[PDB]
Amino acid sequence: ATPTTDHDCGKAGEYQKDLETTLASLADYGTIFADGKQSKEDCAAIKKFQKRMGIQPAEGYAGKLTLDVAQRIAKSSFDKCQEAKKGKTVCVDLTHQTLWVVEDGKRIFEPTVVRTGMAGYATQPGAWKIFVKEGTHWSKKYKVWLPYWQNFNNGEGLHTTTTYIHEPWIGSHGCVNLLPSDSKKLYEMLDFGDTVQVFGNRPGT
Amino acid sequence: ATPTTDHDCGKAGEYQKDLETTLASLADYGTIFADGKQSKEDCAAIKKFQKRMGIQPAEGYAGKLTLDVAQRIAKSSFDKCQEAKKGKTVCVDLTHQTLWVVEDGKRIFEPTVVRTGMAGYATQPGAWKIFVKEGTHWSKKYKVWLPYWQNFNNGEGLHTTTTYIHEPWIGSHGCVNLLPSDSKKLYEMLDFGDTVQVFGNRPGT
Amino acid sequence: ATPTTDHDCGKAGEYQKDLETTLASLADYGTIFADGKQSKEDCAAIKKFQKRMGIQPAEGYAGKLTLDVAQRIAKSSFDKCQEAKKGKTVCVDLTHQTLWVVEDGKRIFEPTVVRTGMAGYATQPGAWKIFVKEGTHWSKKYKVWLPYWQNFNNGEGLHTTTTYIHEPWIGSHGCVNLLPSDSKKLYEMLDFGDTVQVFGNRPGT
Incomplete structure (x- = not known):
């Protein structure tokens, strides 16, 4: 229902907001809170995406590569x-x-x-x-x-x-x-x- | 129960009767009316056989090749x-x-x-x-x-x-x-x- | 419950007792009577093991090779x-x-x-x-x-x-x-x- 603000991932990367939005539209990576803030739920979603697309490490960080890949997948x-x-x-x-x-x-x-x-x-x-x-x-x-x-x-x-x-x-x-x-x-x-x-x-x- | 005489296949080929009989004995191609007349049911059976045995096109026509193949299969x-x-x-x-x-x-x-x-x-x-x-x-x-x-x-x-x-x-x-x-x-x-x-x-x- | 003494396998081989014990500890070859006597049940267990480990023939005989293989498997x-x-x-x-x-x-x-x-x-x-x-x-x-x-x-x-x-x-x-x-x-x-x-x-x- 609401984001779990206590998580073991990094402070939100620069592309957190856009990545959250893209992954939400892909609609296969679980609960996402599109607010630009990292959470336990958003971290899990990002890690799942990173693992599936072979982004290494899959550490939940909303970096440029992860956003670029997410956008490529979405714009196929x-x-x-x-x-x-x-x-x-x-x-x-x-x-x-x-x-x-x-x-x-x-x-x-x-x-x-x-x-x-x-x-x-x-x-x-x-x-x-x-x-x-x-x-x-x-x-x-x-x-x-x-x-x-x-x-x-x-x-x-x-x-x-x-x-x-x-x-x-x-x-x-x-x-x-x-x-x-x-x-x-x-x-x-x-x-x-x-x-x-x-x-x-x-x-x- | 009775043949559907209105179908989208050709008028019966020369070997319709013998093919119907052979396919009926093979007993794996559905409802067959062994009467020498083409029907929706007989056409479906012939097309199924033709597809399975790689007869191209599978157009439901009781031609010589289709009968020859059916007889070969039956006489194995x-x-x-x-x-x-x-x-x-x-x-x-x-x-x-x-x-x-x-x-x-x-x-x-x-x-x-x-x-x-x-x-x-x-x-x-x-x-x-x-x-x-x-x-x-x-x-x-x-x-x-x-x-x-x-x-x-x-x-x-x-x-x-x-x-x-x-x-x-x-x-x-x-x-x-x-x-x-x-x-x-x-x-x-x-x-x-x-x-x-x-x-x-x-x-x- | 009790061994079937009437069987179609050979009289017990020299390593019957030790093989029975080893196979019982492996615990995947069915009913075993660890008594040094061949039975229908022990023969079936030995044959199953011999087949699985490619011992040819799988004739139920508690020979040296079969015991050696059983011990190797157990001591892995x-x-x-x-x-x-x-x-x-x-x-x-x-x-x-x-x-x-x-x-x-x-x-x-x-x-x-x-x-x-x-x-x-x-x-x-x-x-x-x-x-x-x-x-x-x-x-x-x-x-x-x-x-x-x-x-x-x-x-x-x-x-x-x-x-x-x-x-x-x-x-x-x-x-x-x-x-x-x-x-x-x-x-x-x-x-x-x-x-x-x-x-x-x-x-x-």
Whole structure:
């Protein structure tokens, strides 16, 4: 009913108010008091969001990264993703660096964070079908193991990120990097022939 | 109780009567009126069968291919498949170009369509154990990705067909081609060491 | 309530009494009468244990191997396995040649038998994270397919044993050999980044 002002998290960060508002509109992170003040409830909501989106540490602090990610998730361009006729469509919003999945006109996987091709390695827009799935793929070019590999376009694929996903300057080299939990879930959910619909443009690419 | 004569399918094809009879004996495609006349019920049954057996389009037309497939399924040589002592036995009837699975004296996977080796590439008869499973196998010989690969004999394996399975002249080159739904299901069901029992002979090979 | 003295198993083996006692303490193999006499109940318990631990044949005979395996399972060094902070920890007790799994301070996979590196090929002790998973791995060094491959240290990995696991002189060459049932279960249970904690020393290595 009312905020618990005694909590074990930091004093409210600069973006507390805007983050609270954004998370409340997402409507999946529990009780939120949109007042710009940190509370036990707001801290729990922020930590839950941070854990889900792989923000490390998940310490409840309403920092710039956490607000930026929350806004990207909230602004995911649902109306810009062309759904394929058959199977599922993996919607890859390059502009917001988010991903969701649709089947038969309904979202079956809610937006999550991704990291796509950095400057010089931009992920090619288009409609691409998954044609290779490997539990772990050895990249001959990059000399690295890529978990939960799903190739959709000439070696551009979905896979578990091998570096911290929120560092924009170290990846990707064309692939769609995913958090471990999301990559595993998508590996189980998606079929051969499902469409990866890549649209927009990653800022700075 | 009685056929619905008003339907959105074509006027009955030449093999309507025989197809209705065959599907009724299969006893898994719903209400059928074995009268040689197309109805809403018979059309639904035929479409369901066509979808299950990967006949494209599944438009409810009692054509030659659909009857031929239905008869192959119905005539699957259950008594010609030697069951292995341990694990499951994948029964590959080369004569009828069908496949089913038995375990502990009972069928756990009902007959489905396959395409095995064409003339010059006939699939070798015998009792063969699955010893390699790959989510996707790259064939070095044929330069193609083969989904849900299960190798049982020197590179002759189960996998998802890469071309329309009902075209007899374009495959296989020795492997047992399967429909996508069936290949995935068999990949999940079958274990290392399960026996692939290949018998009969593909007509024209 | 009382032993059924009429059974279809052999006259009691030399280690009947000690095996009965060990299996009773394991407390998962049903009714046991710890009297040194074979019975229908004791035979059933011994066969169940033999089947679970891949002792072939599982004929209910209280032989040396069966007692040795039972004692290894019972003496598994639970307090010697350092649990990792994140994910699951696969505890590999080289001294007892057994394996179990812990998560959040609790065992989620009870001890089973393994075979690790033989003399000259001893499995390296330490804390190692699973970084490659393959349904079947082709060993270039040993020219063999290894099912349910989970690489944790420079090609030392978990996989299904390719030879009878209870023959100490024919393996392994560094890997942790597992029974088929256990390897499949661990392949499904374990994640990338789970820790393989290898400790102790295989006797004679």
